[PDB]
Amino acid sequence: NFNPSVGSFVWVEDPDEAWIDGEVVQVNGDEIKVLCTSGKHVVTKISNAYPKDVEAPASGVDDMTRLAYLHEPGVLQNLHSRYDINEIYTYTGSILIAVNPFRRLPHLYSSHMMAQYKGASLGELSPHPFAVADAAYRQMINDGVSQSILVSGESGAGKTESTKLLMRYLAYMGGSVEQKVLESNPVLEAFGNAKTVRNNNSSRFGKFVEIQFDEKGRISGAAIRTYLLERSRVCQVSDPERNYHCFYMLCAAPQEDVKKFKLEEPKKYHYLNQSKCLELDSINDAEEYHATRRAMDVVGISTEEQDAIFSVVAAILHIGNIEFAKGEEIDSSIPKDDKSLFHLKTAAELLSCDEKALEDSLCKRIMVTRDETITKTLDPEAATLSRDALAKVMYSRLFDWLVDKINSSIGQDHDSKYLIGVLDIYGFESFKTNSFEQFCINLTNEKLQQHFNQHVFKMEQEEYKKEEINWSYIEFVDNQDILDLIEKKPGGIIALLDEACMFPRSTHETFAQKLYQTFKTHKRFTKPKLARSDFTICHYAGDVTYQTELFLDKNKDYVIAEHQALLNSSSCSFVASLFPPMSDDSKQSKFSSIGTRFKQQLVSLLEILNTTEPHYIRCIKPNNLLKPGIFENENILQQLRCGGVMEAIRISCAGYPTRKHFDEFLARFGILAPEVLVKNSDDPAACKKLLDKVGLEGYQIGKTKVFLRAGQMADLDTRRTEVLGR
Ligand SMILES: Nc1ncnc2c1ncn2[C@@H]1O[C@H](COP(=O)(O)OP(=O)(O)O)[C@@H](O)[C@H]1O
Ligand code: ALF
Ligand SMILES: [Mg+2]
Ligand SMILES: [Mg+2]
């Protein structure tokens, strides 16, 4: 076991900074007194203490499994040391660990650096996402099976940056399709990314990039898949956060390019004024407009199609400045001041429709009756809800048109045999107020971590028990019950939300009370005492309390009748093309459920990833100030524990990554030792004896399969290739 010396350096617990560095000064029977470099003297039992590796280089260890002292402080200190010398990447078994640098490293990601990793093995070079990308490319041809790379972490930990690296390297192995997949990121980030408290350039939509490869290995096609874009940001923004980049790009654009839009300072427009943050130090909005147009030309978006897109973006900004006051008649709406009539006229001119038809779209809805057509009027509060509804649907139809035009140039089938898919989702985020959009984001992260848990801890250890192997079970925290809490078919938070959405005039307190009487006897569900309509979920990353105030509203997906009627009446080809013409030999739907639609998309994505061989990259956010050179133990310790990094190191150190059937084993490696006899095609004793003849040790013989350590299968294929070639 462990026995501390009278004078030695050990790790001890501390209220802050997690573990602290100390030196024992006194030794009792079972307790010891440590002395930290800080000077404080702590007293604790020996079992709480952990030995410290004094002989540790600043470079640390490239693999956490090769660490001399496997425990939490050594993992934390190995990470910290490599972070100080700008070595952000580090391996854990086959998994890659990435700590956010929060600074530019041009040499670490140059195209020359790609050539260095072109033929490199996973462990030959220093850890890098290019090595994970190459591993996915090599394992695709050696197996003929599709691959997928899965990037995880909390919000702002570097998933989107990590995905850009994988795409730049994957385009290098198959190489005009390559250029357009790389230029699709700036276009989508202009309309799907915005500043939050967690990330200055936070992804508000999840993407799944699919790279197609033919049998020869060329990049035949590529496709991008986007999931639940947040459109509520268009209308309501918190003070720290910012609206989508496109709005600020257009206000910083050269005046001759946007002279027709009649744009003002950003602080004037209602959809941006709520934030009170209009500029970013890390983002130059003027350059982003020039970069986005440049990227749009690469994808093939016509310059005339670019003008109509920005006309919609500038129109949405004008629409937000249309205030409503009480009309002369009861429950009537009218523009408040003459400035709202300016914006109402401008937004109609930018949308190529009638100014009065636009005004009648927000102030007055029409009731549907077979006997005659009647028009009611709206109160100012109802009219405000009608203009915010118009903007959201206009922005999502615009964002969806982009993803359709992107794949209309880079998406095609050349009868390819397999693909590689890198997955970029939104990270687990928690704010002082948590809406329905957060509920789906954290659900997505919850589902991805379960996939990690299954393919790393559940499926691996079931085989170990199945094969009668000598093995100590490694316990872990499973989040399956949280998934059953949300997407259970016979009553889940998603399923219950559709129930309350069917009943008209259902308040958020009724859906709230329904959650309490149903999930009362549950471990992962909690209710705040003073909050009637707020519910808390014990997420794997931490407790998050949600507000159901807007849950029923965010879930219903519908198109306002007079909204689609106006947008269809537009003289501009692009504006009318944003809404499909329904009701002509077509079915009319009351509303569609976003919760079930998003759940269905999440299951289909999971089923495609279950047919591919996965590769994991765990991103880590080192600090919350979004600045470099700040390594915080508490932030990183809580991410390692809830992410299961400690258990993964334990499974990678003692586990067996590769297993082959006896018949597959004697066929390939029986040629290594011709003198070793074999009784039949699947004889287990020959496997034991053929491995001893080669000199391998630590292997384990199972019920029906052999089990080898991380690098033991690799040298057997190299030994085989040498003898068969001779
Ligand atoms: N490899 C990297 N090189 C440079 N900056 C990085 C890198 N990874 C992350 N960052 C920084 O972290 C920020 C957030 O990263 P991002 O990919 O947006 O995380 P997430 O997708 O999880 O929100 C970036 O805007 C950038 O400043
Ligand atoms: F932009 Al994120 F998690 F915050 F992908
Ligand atoms: Mg992102
Ligand atoms: Mg929404």
Numbering used by the authors: 4 to 178, 186 to 736
What text comes from the article?
pmcMyosins are motor proteins that convert chemical energy, ATP, to physical force to move actin filaments. Myosin XI produces an intracellular flow known as cytoplasmic streaming in plant cells by moving on actin filaments while binding organelles via its tail domain.
Although class XI myosin is the fastest myosin class in the myosin superfamily, the atomic structure of the class XI myosin MD has yet to be solved. We chose Arabidopsis myosin MYA2 (AtXI-2) as the crystallization target, because AtXI-2 has a standard velocity among class XI myosins, it is faster than most animal myosins, and its ATPase activity is more stable than those of Chara myosins. AtXI-2 has an amino acid sequence relatively similar to that of CbXI-1 MD, having 63% identity and 87% similarity. Although there are some deviations in the position of the main chain, the nucleotide interaction region including switch I and switch II is almost identical. Thus, the structure near the nucleotide-binding region of myosin XI was not markedly different from those of myosins of other classes (myosin II, myosin VI, and myosin XIV). This result suggests that the magnitude of the angular change in the converter domain is not related to the fast velocity of class XI myosin.
